[PDB]
Structure 1
C-alpha cells in the first residue's frame, strides 16, 4: 500500500513536470494528495519495532503533513489556472521529499554495554598499574606479569572495544583495513594467555625451588620472558596480515561482478579471517595447550604447598596461588564461548547461531578485561 502510493507520487510528479496545460497539473495534484493522505497512515517497513508514537512515526507523519501542505499550495495555484507557479510548487515537493522520507534498537544496547565495559576496563586496570608501578616495593616478576596484563586489558578497553563498535556499525572500507582492525584483539588475547602462563610458572618456581628462586629468576630474565610473550603475541597475532585470510573468496566475488582493484567490503569479522586459522592455529595450538599446561602447573603448586604443611610464607603463597588459579579459570571461562563459536562455524557452516548468544559471548570475552581488576582488588582485601 505504501510503495504504490510512493510511486504514484513519483510518476504523477513527473506528469506535472511534463504537463502542458493546467488540467493535467490539477488532476495529478489531486491524485498526489489522495496517495499522500493514504500513505500518511502507513508504517515504513524499516520501523517494525518502533512504537506507534515513537519519534520516527511522528517525524514521518510530520513530513507527510508538510507534504500535504505543499500539495495544497500547488493545487490552490492550479485551480486559478496558473500552471507556471503550480509547476514550481511541484518543484518544491522534491526538496521536501529529500529532507525527510529519504532517511538499531537491539544493536544500540550492544553498543552501550560495550561503552560501559570500556569505562570499567580502562580505569580499573590503570588503577592496578598505579598500585603496582608507583609503589617501589612492588618490583617483582609476578608483579611485572601483572603490570603487562593490566596494560593488555587497558588496551582492550581502549582499542578492542572502540574497534568493536566500529566493526558493528560497519563502514565500507578496504580489505586490508579490516585486517588492521581485526588483529589487535588476537594479539592482546594471546598476550593475556602468555601472561597468565608466566604467572603460573613463577608460582611454581616460588613453591618448588624457593631456596634459589631469587637467584634463578633474575629481573633481566623477567624482562626477557615478558618481551618473548609480547613477541609471540605479535607473531600469532599478525599472522592474518602475513597472508592467511579469506582474500580468495572476497576477490573472486569482486571479480565476478566485473570490477577490479582493491576489494571493498562491509568489514565483518567472519569475512576477513580464515576460521582454519582461528580453530586449528590460534586456538588448538596457542590457547588450549597453554590452558592445559597451566592446569598441570597449578595442580603441582597446590600439591607442593599441601605436602609442605615458616608456615606464614607458604600460607601466603597458597593465597596468591588461589587468586592466580581463580583468575586463570575466569579467563578460560570468559573466553571459551567465542572460541567454541568459531569451532561451530568451521565444523558446521550450515548451523547458524542466534545472534543473542553471540552478543553474550562477545560480552564475556571483552568483559573479562573489566573482571580482572575487581577480582584482584578483592583478593587484596582477602590477604
Structure 2
C-alpha cells in the first residue's frame, strides 16, 4: 500500500515468527521438567507467556492498525487497547525478574525461605492486574472521544463516528506521555538500573573477599540486559514525547514505524538473554 509500510509489515511478521516459537519453547521446557519449578522460573515463565502473547496477538493487531481499515470508534478502542495491555505486561515481568535477582545477592542465606514460590505467584498476578489497568485506561474515557466528535459534527454526520483507525487517532498523547511513559515505563527502567548497579557491587564485593575474568563477564551480562531494554522501549516513547511537547516538530514517517518494531523486538530477544543463559534451562533444551 506503500513502500515503507510494506517493509514494516515484513519485519513485524518475522519478529512474530521468532517471538512465538522461542517463547513457547521456554514454556515447554518449563512444563516438561520439574527441576524448573522454583521461585525464579515462575517469573521467567511469566515473562514467557507475556512475550508469546506479544508474538501471537500484538503483532497481527499492530499490522491491522497500520493498514487503517475504516472502523467505528468504540470498536477501534477494543482493537487498540490489547496492544497496550500485553506490551506493558512484558515490561513489568522484566522488572520482577530484576527484584528476584537482587534478592539472591542481598539476602542469599534466607532467600529460599523468604521468596517462596507461593509468594512468587501473588507478585506475578500483581504484575498482570497492573498490566490490565494501564491498558484499559483508554476505554474508561481517556481518549480522543472529545476531539473526534467535534470533527465528525463539523462535516455534518450524526450517530457514532466512523474513522480511519490509527493509534494516534483514538489514543490521546497526553495519556501515552504522562501515564504510560512517565509512570509505567520510565520508573521500571530506572528501577532496573538501580537494582543492577547494586547487584554488581554485592557480586564484586564477594568475589574480591581468574577472578577478574568472571567479574567482567558478569558486568557484560548486566550491561547487555539493560541496554536491550533501553534500546527497545525508549525510542518509541521519545517519539510520542516530541509529538506532544513539540507539535510542529516534523519527523519522518518510517522513523515512527522503525521505533514500533524495536518495541516488539524486545519480546524476541527475551528468551535468548534471560532463559538461555541459565545452565539448568539450557541443558534440558539441548537434551
Q: TM-score, normalised by structure 1?
A: 0.68
Deviation at 1:179, TM superposition (A): 1.4
CA separation in 2, counterparts of 1:243 and 1:121?
32
Greater relative contact order (CA < 8 Å, ≥ 6 in sequence) = 2
Does the aligned pair in 1 maintain the 2:143–2:172 contact within 8 Å?
Answer: yes
Listed as ranges, the gaps of 5+ residues in structure 1 are 1-103
Distance verdict in 2 for CA 1:298–1:106, change over 3 Å: closer
SS of match in other structure, 2:24? helix
Per-residue Cα deviation, 1:157-212 (whole angstroms, up to 9, x for no partner): 11111011111221111101211121122212221221111111111111011111
Distance verdict in 2 for CA 1:155–1:313, change over 3 Å: farther
Q: Over the residues paired in the alignment, what is the CA RMSD in angstroms?
A: 2.9
CA separation in 2, counterparts of 1:236 and 1:118?
23
Per-residue Cα deviation, 1:276-308 (whole angstroms, up to 9, x for no partner): 110111111111112111111111111111111
SS of match in other structure, 1:312? coil
Per-residue Cα deviation, 1:58-95 (whole angstroms, up to 9, x for no partner): xxxxxxxxxxxxxxxxxxxxxxxxxxxxxxxxxxxxxx
Aligned length: 280
CA separation in 2, counterparts of 1:321 and 1:131?
28
Q: TM-score, normalised by structure 2?
A: 0.89
Distance verdict in 2 for CA 1:192–1:350, change over 3 Å: same
Does the aligned pair in 1 maintain the 2:42–2:117 contact within 8 Å?
Answer: no
CA separation in 2, counterparts of 1:324 and 1:133?
27
Does the aligned pair in 1 maintain the 2:193–2:226 contact within 8 Å?
Answer: no
Does the aligned pair in 1 maintain the 2:46–2:93 contact within 8 Å?
Answer: yes
CA separation in 1, counterparts of 2:213 and 2:118?
28
Does the aligned pair in 2 maintain the 1:275–1:342 contact within 8 Å?
Answer: yes
Deviation at 1:106, TM superposition (A): 3.3
CA separation in 1, counterparts of 2:122 and 2:218?
23
Per-residue Cα deviation, 1:94-115 (whole angstroms, up to 9, x for no partner): xxxxxxxxxx333222222211
Q: Which is higher, the Rg of structure 1 or of structure 2?
A: 1
Distance verdict in 2 for CA 1:328–1:178, change over 3 Å: farther
CA separation in 2, counterparts of 1:310 and 1:216?
27
Listed as ranges, the gaps of 5+ residues in structure 2 are 281-286
Does the aligned pair in 2 maintain the 1:279–1:343 contact within 8 Å?
Answer: yes
Deviation at 1:374, TM superposition (A): 2.8
Distance verdict in 2 for CA 1:131–1:311, change over 3 Å: farther
Deviation at 1:372, TM superposition (A): 1.8
Per-residue Cα deviation, 1:130-175 (whole angstroms, up to 9, x for no partner): 1223211011222111111111111111111101111122111110
Distance verdict in 2 for CA 1:296–1:377, change over 3 Å: closer
Alignment of 1:96-115 (within 5 A): 104-115=2-13
